[PDB]
């Protein structure tokens, strides 16, 4: 089970990832603070750190709580794993559209053809399928690239935003196109119920299709379109269900030889309209209008493997996550979790794929077969520690890691008293592991993938069952290292694996763009600091 370079490791490391254990100073409904956790009370003192596990720090949209899949992905990868909204928002901030290869291709086609380009997508700040800022940036870039004509097909939201917020986004859009860029024309408004169907209800898609290719709908212009929407509002027709509104007449329709960019980043609700325009699914619409010839369609992301469309943001890769890299260094490793989080210490920790690397030994501890986990809040934490202690007493693997599920899965039941017991059981397990690590020459690091159990009561005293935005601990028993935050940002989950490799005396692969957040210090200086 060993690997050839095990004897080159400077420090063996045991990494405990507690699931759903965050750092909150508010004791109300705080199952971690109120639980008896004498082990974590000591580990989380002196030289320890509090690192970010939510929102932009882990590649999630700003303000969004962490989660087990993203958390284990970021911990295992040693880099920020960007979700699409964050990656595209950064490209907007950094003016990266104007040099985007697929966008430049689309703009070249229009300039070498009939000069006509279309943008189509959900216009709101919801951030779930699209962002209005993305569309504004595309307009700016397409102007800078000198496309003669740009037409916008505005899909109404009211689902990821309030049902009457479309008027505002419409007002913002009109002012933007007229005053800010003085370029581009709004051509269609239609609700996402029609344009963004994902249930193969092609009679819905046809309403959007015929609006874009044939102006089927209510005619309007820049001066009156907002009042039309207000009229629909008064008739109980909200953004999601806006029947089409047609501007610019025939000039703004999708015509023969035109170019189309769909700017939604999420695939499920673009597969249909994009394939109707760019492939053969216009047939399903059974329209009395002919399909325009020689169209070419581009997407913000890849909507389906088998679609031919170029994408502005193709899928990213994650080479040399920690588990891959340890194997490449010929260092063996051990991953352990109970059933409910076994995928997270394998599939997600290892980069989001079913791959076990060379030298990677795994251990699955069965979760208890109970109706809900508040009935056995300790879950199988004891058996996870048992397996880890076996590995520490053997000393075979220089890197071992486990997950402890109780705080998150009991936290999800909303039962505060059960969560307190889940945290007490986790603390006991961590203490038994800690004793073994100190006996057998392992440095112990404890972290979490995101918070949960520290906030068990909602503001009305009811159950709180969700993940949180609180920081998570990062501990280290090795006295020869001091935690140091990155120079330009808060520490985050992406920094755990670079830190482990630095402690292990192993190289850090170029692909891990996280930073190590420890510095070596002399033992005498460390001891004098504490006193």
């Amino acid at each position: 089970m060993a690997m050839a370079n095990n004897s080159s490791v400077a420090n063996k490391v045991c990494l405990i990832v507690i699931d759903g254990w965050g750092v909150s100073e508010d004791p109300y409904g705080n199952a971690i603070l109120n639980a008896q956790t004498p082990v974590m009370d000591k580990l989380c003192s002196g030289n320890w750190a509090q690192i970010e596990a939510h929102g932009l720090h882990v590649g999630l949209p700003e303000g969004l709580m962490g989660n087990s899949e993203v958390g284990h992905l970021n911990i295992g990868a040693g880099r920020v794993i960007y979700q699409d909204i964050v990656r595209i928002n950064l490209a907007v901030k950094n003016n990266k559209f104007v040099t985007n290869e697929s966008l430049v291709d689309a703009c070249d086609r229009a300039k070498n053809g009939n000069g006509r380009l279309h943008l189509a997508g959900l216009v709101s700040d919801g951030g779930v399928h699209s962002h209005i800022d993305h569309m504004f940036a595309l307009v700016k870039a397409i102007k800078e690239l000198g496309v003669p004509e740009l037409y916008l097909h505005f899909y109404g939201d009211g689902r990821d935003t309030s049902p009457n917020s479309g008027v505002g986004f419409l007002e913002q859009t009109l002012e933007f196109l007229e005053k800010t860029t003085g370029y581009g024309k709004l051509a269609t408004v239609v609700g996402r119920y029609y344009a963004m169907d994902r249930d193969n209800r092609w009679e819905r898609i046809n309403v959007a299709y015929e609006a874009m290719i044939g102006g089927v709908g209510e005619t309007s212009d820049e001066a009156g379109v907002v009042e039309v929407v207000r009229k629909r509002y008064a008739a109980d027709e909200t953004d999601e269900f806006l029947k089409p509104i047609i501007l610019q007449g025939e000039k703004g329709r999708v015509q023969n030889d035109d170019t189309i960019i769909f700017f939604d980043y999420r695939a499920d609700r673009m597969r249909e309209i994009s394939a109707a325009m760019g492939m053969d699914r216009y047939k399903d619409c059974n329209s009395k209008l002919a399909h325009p010839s020689n169209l070419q369609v581009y997407g913000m992301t890849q909507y389906k493997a088998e679609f031919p469309f170029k994408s502005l943001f193709p899928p990213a890769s994650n080479k040399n996550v920690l588990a891959e890299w340890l194997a490449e260094q010929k260092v063996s490793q051990f991953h352990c979790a109970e059933t409910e989080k076994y995928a997270h210490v394998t599939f997600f920790f290892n980069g989001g794929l079913e791959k076990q690397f060379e030298g990677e030994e795994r251990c699955l501890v069965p979760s208890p077969k109970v109706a809900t986990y508040d009935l056995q809040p300790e879950m199988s934490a004891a058996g996870v520690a048992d397996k880890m202690i076996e590995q520490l007493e053997a000393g075979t693997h220089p890197f071992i890691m486990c997950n402890f599920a109780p705080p998150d899965m009991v936290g999800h039941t909303g039962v505060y008293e059960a969560a307190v017991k889940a945290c007490e059981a986790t603390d006991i397990a961590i203490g038994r592991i800690y004793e073994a690590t100190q006996k057998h020459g392992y440095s112990l690091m404890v972290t979490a993938d995101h918070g949960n159990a520290e906030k068990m009561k909602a503001p009305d005293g009811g159950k709180h069952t969700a993940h949180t935005c609180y920081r998570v601990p990062l501990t280290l028993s090795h006295p020869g290292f001091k935690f140091v935050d990155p120079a330009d940002r808060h520490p985050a989950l992406c920094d755990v694996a670079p830190t482990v490799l630095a402690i292990m005396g192993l190289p850090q692969p170029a692909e891990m763009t996280g930073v190590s957040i420890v510095q070596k210090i002399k033992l005498a200086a460390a001891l004098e600091h504490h006193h």
Partner: peptide, 13 residues
């Protein structure tokens, strides 16, 4: 939150 329950902004858990 608003991303319920997309993989992996907000998976079922």
């Amino acid at each position: 939150x608003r991303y319920e329950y997309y993989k992996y902004e907000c998976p079922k858990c």
